[PDB]
Structure formats: C-alpha cells, structure tokens
Design an enzyme around this catalytic site. Structure first.
Site, PDB file in Angstrom:
ATOM      1  N   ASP A 192       5.002 -16.899   6.447  1.00  0.00           N
ATOM      2  CA  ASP A 192       4.015 -16.256   5.593  1.00  0.00           C
ATOM      3  C   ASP A 192       4.693 -15.398   4.535  1.00  0.00           C
ATOM      4  O   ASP A 192       5.094 -14.274   4.814  1.00  0.00           O
ATOM      5  CB  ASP A 192       3.096 -15.382   6.453  1.00  0.00           C
TER       6      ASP A 192
ATOM      7  N   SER B 288       1.316 -16.242 -13.915  1.00  0.00           N
ATOM      8  CA  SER B 288       1.142 -17.572 -14.469  1.00  0.00           C
ATOM      9  C   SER B 288       0.733 -17.466 -15.937  1.00  0.00           C
ATOM     10  O   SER B 288       0.047 -16.527 -16.344  1.00  0.00           O
ATOM     11  CB  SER B 288       0.085 -18.334 -13.664  1.00  0.00           C
TER      12      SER B 288
END
Length: 330
Positions: free
Chosen positions: A35, A199
């Site tokens: 994770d 992004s």
C-alpha cells in the site's frame, strides 16, 4: 541488493493485490497488500481477536526465534475506506522477493474491522508511503522500503500491476524490459506523507486532451481512480445510461456498455487506461447495473490515482533524497 516479488489480484475484479512476504525465523509467509498510501506493516497474528479471524494466515511471533517485542509500542490506523486495525509491535526479519530487512517493525493486530475479517485473502498490509505517516507510538517506525533503502542498488521500488493478471513489485532496480518507450518523471510533494504529484490533464476516449493540473496520490492500496467531480462527470457523460447513484455510492453504468478509455497526463507524456479497466462489474450478483472504476473524489479531500490508473503503467517510486515518481506505458 534487490528484491522482486509477484503480486496477484485477490479476485476477478482486481479489487486488491497480494504479495507474499516472509516474516520471522523459520519463515512465516503471509500474503500482504502493498500500500503506497500508508506506512504501517501490520499482520493478522496469534494475538488477533479470534472472532475477527476468518481464513487469514497468521503471524505467530512466539514461533519466530528472531522476533522481539518492541516494549510499550502500540499502533492504531484508520483507512480512507473506513476500515481500521490496531495492536502491539514486534521487530523481526522480513523478506520480500529475496530482499531482507532485519529489525523491521511488524505490527501485530489485536483488533481488525469487519472488512478485514471478511477478506480471507489479505493477511495484512505493507505500507510504502513515507515513514512520517507510520502510526506506532511512542516511537514511530520506518517502512520496509525506508529500512531497505540504503542497501539497495538504487533507492527505488517499482509497481507493475496487472489487469486481471499477476504483476511485479521490484526493489532496488528498474527492469528496462517491463515497459515500452521512456519513463517520464514528475515531482513529488511529501508534505502529507504520500507519493503526491500533479497530473497535467486528461482525455476521455478519443477526445481532445484537457490541460489542467490535478494534484493526487499514487496509491496501490486503493482500488479505483478518484478524480474531481468535473472530470468524472465528463467521463461518464460519454456512456449511455451512466449515472451517479447515491444509493449505490457512486457512478454506475449499464453492464451492456462498451466503456471509453481514459487518458491522464504525466508531464508531456500520456498514460491510457483502457475502457475495460474501468468496469467493476455488477453492483450485486446478477444485476445489469455495473459499478464504475472512475469515481468522484469530492468529500475525500484528495484525488487518488489508485489501481485502475496505476495498472495501466509501469510506475517508479524514486526514493532519492528528493523523491520523484516515474510513469511509463507498457
């Protein structure tokens, strides 16, 4: 040193991925959920409340000659999906894919929430976010990667998750045969303890690319892609019959649909998520309403590039003095 381990979807939907991890002496192999959005290595154990264990493999520290109680240390964690676990702490030898760390903090669960109990395939979590998020008290502990880093050939790990197929976590090297083209690196903020990056935009299907900054985290422990409501609405508007269902808890779509792809930007590069990666199947057994793999982050407080996004790429988690993230197509 290096390590290399195969990671395997837990079910036919890729709801999560498990990777075998050797703990203790002699080795006890547990299948952990790696994770990159958390920083605790915790396991089902011989200390876990018996009624809260249902099929998991447990770590028994009393059977490990290298286990030592970390005296006075406790831990307690709550995840974004509302699940939680807590317990006490041992140090022991932990190996992943041939890479060994001695003195790793292994957090032994005394209590786990129902969603953990109900998932027989996940024996615990191995956190790969920054150690500043580790929950051990009163002395915070380091992640497996943080402990291994100085020994690694290069201070990196890579995630290469498969779509409905196994993939690979590598530590200490970049497998140049595992991706196509080049790797595009992008800046990371560690201020919130995550692999947080920005992004450069998105496209839906064959549509034009929208240049827009989207801050979010690269999180292998989250199944879906969670993005701003504007972006998510633009995606699902291209699917006839798709709608946001408050009763179901997100966007659903007709199982008869053919889903469009979704592209996200990494600098000037582009990663394309095929439409099929966005199908999470019937909302309940036999239903013709299917659950979407792109969902709104509104009310989470952060955008999450979970497995839906990451499995479309070869992803480099660069733990150099100034960390960065790399993405390549594959």
């Amino acid at each position: 040193s290096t390590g290399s381990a195969t990671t395997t979807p837990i079910d036919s939907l890729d709801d999560a991925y498990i990777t075998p991890v050797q703990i203790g002496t002699p080795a006890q192999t547990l299948n952990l959920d790696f994770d990159t959005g958390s920083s605790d290595l915790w396991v089902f154990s011989s200390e876990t409340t018996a009624s809260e264990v249902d099929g998991q493999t447990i770590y028994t520290p009393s059977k490990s000659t290298t286990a030592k109680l970390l005296s006075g240390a406790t831990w307690s964690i709550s995840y974004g999906d509302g699940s939680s676990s807590s317990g006490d702490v041992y140090t022991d030898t932990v190996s992943v894919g041939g890479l060994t760390v001695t003195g790793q903090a292994v957090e032994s669960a005394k209590k786990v929430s129902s969603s953990f109990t109900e998932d027989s395939t996940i024996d615990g979590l191995l956190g790969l976010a920054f150690s500043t998020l580790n929950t051990v008290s009163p002395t915070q502990q380091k992640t497996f990667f943080d402990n291994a880093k100085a020994s690694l050939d290069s201070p990196v790990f890579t995630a290469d998750l498969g779509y409905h197929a196994p993939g690979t976590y590598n530590f200490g090297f970049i497998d140049t045969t595992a991706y196509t083209g080049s790797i595009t690196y992008t800046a990371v903020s560690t201020k919130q303890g995550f692999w947080e990056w920005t992004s450069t935009g998105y496209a839906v299907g064959s549509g034009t690319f929208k240049s827009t900054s989207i801050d979010g985290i690269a999180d292998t422990g989250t199944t879906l892609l969670y993005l701003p409501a504007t972006v998510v609405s633009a995606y699902w508007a291209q699917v006839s019959g798709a709608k946001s269902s408050s009763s179901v808890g997100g966007y659903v779509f007709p199982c008869s649909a053919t889903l469009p792809s979704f592209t996200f930007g990494v600098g000037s590069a582009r990663i394309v998520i095929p439409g099929d990666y966005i199908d999470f199947g019937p909302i309940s057994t036999g239903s013709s309403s299917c659950f979407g793999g792109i969902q709104s982050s509104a009310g989470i407080g952060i955008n999450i590039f979970g497995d839906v996004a990451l499995k479309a790429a070869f992803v480099v988690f660069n733990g150099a003095t100034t960390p960065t993230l790399g993405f390549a197509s594959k």
